Structures are given as C-alpha cells and as structure tokens.
Amino acid sequence: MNDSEFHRLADQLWLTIEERLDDWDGDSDIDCEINGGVLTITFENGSKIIINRQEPLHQVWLATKQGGYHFDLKGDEWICDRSGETFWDLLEQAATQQAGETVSFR
Incomplete structure (x- = not known):
C-alpha cells in the first residue's frame, strides 16, 4: 500500500540525489551526510540542505536558505507544496545560492 510506495520512492530519491551531488564538482566543496532517513x-x-521525511503515506520535507517547504508529487516531477514549485529546479536554486555555482541536478 503506502509504506512500500513511500519506501521505494524514498530509496530512489535518496540514492539519486546523493549520487548526483557526490558526483558533480563545483566552485565550493561538497560533503553529503547520510543519516537514518536523513540527507544533509x-x-x-x-x-x-536539510532532507528528512514525515508521514509514511506520501510526505517528505526539504529545507534550505529561504526556509523551504515540503515536497509533494504532481506527476513525473515533485513540486514544493508552497505555491507549487519544483523538485530539481528549486533544489537547484537552493543549492546554487548556497554553494555559489549552478548545482546541476538536471
């Protein structure tokens, strides 16, 4: 049902995000933290960037510079719930503004 859906989603996010930013270089340096259901x-x-998770339904958080908001799914792309923002793109703006160079998730 839900817990399984949540977990498989969580796995692919956690993995691909961590992998992507461990991979890409930059102006600044990068160390990814991996804690128990938490990426930092x-x-x-x-x-x-602070990534951690809420309900085992479909609900995950993300926090950054401007504060941030929770992370919810539209279709092929997660939005930020806020007004309805965007996964990779807002995460780009967040990471980019803290790091000092375009942090390329797409």
Whole structure:
C-alpha cells in the first residue's frame, strides 16, 4: 500500500540525489551526510540542505536558505507544496545560492 510506495520512492530519491551531488564538482566543496532517513547536503561554506521525511503515506520535507517547504508529487516531477514549485529546479536554486555555482541536478 503506502509504506512500500513511500519506501521505494524514498530509496530512489535518496540514492539519486546523493549520487548526483557526490558526483558533480563545483566552485565550493561538497560533503553529503547520510543519516537514518536523513540527507544533509553540506558545502564548504557550512550551509546546507536539510532532507528528512514525515508521514509514511506520501510526505517528505526539504529545507534550505529561504526556509523551504515540503515536497509533494504532481506527476513525473515533485513540486514544493508552497505555491507549487519544483523538485530539481528549486533544489537547484537552493543549492546554487548556497554553494555559489549552478548545482546541476538536471
């Protein structure tokens, strides 16, 4: 049902995100933190993206510079619930603004 859906989604996000940002270089440095259901994407500046998760239905969080918002699914692309933003793109703007160079998720 839900827990399984949540978990498989979680697995693919967690993996692909961590992998992507461990892979890509930059201006700044990058150390990804992996904790128990938590990712924390940390630059040499000391600033960071906070990723952690809420309900085992479909609900995940993400926090950054401007604060952030929770992460909800539209279709092939997660939005931020806020007004209805975007996964990879807003995450780009977040990471980019804290790191100091285009952090390329797409």
